[PDB]
Amino acid sequence: REVMANLTARVVGAARRGTLLEKRETVKSVALLVVTPDRGLCGSLVAN
Amino acid sequence: EGLNLVATALAVGLGAIGPGVGIGIIVSGAVQAIGRNPEIENRVVTYMFIGIAFTEALAIFGLVIAFLIGF
Structure with missing residues (x-):
């Protein structure tokens, strides 16, 4: 988790984050x- | 004597030696950088050229001399 925190603090590029980290706009x-x-x-x- | 011809040749060749290597380095670096990140292309090229041009100024200087010695 802190590895995620550190790495995401960097590589903020949307194209760089196009892999999984990307947020699909359509959400179709x-x-x-x-x-x-x-x-x-x-x-x-089970029911809840 | 023919020393002016040798001067013109030295000017053009020694002017061409350095800029060739430098321009190769510039374009290689820019191509690699764009290949890594495409969205920054229009910026690096904008810097690329305003770098690349400077180099040939020196080379063009030699070419200028390559004519000034010639005539």
Whole structure:
């Protein structure tokens, strides 16, 4: 994390940051990673 | 005697020796810099040329002498 902090403090170039660090303006497609317990009895978490 | 011809030749050649190397260095550095970062192109070229030109001034000086000795 502090490695991210230091490196991003530099290489601020948008073209340089075009790799992943770039913010897509259109945001036409999005993706959600959902991590859900595998077995139930968990309570209200699986649903929440 | 023919010493004026030798002078003209020395002027042109010795003027050409240094600027050739220098201009090679300038353009090589600018090309590498643009290849690394394209968006800065229009700036470095703007500096590139106002560097590059200066060098040939010296060379042109020799060429000027290469005619002044000639005539």
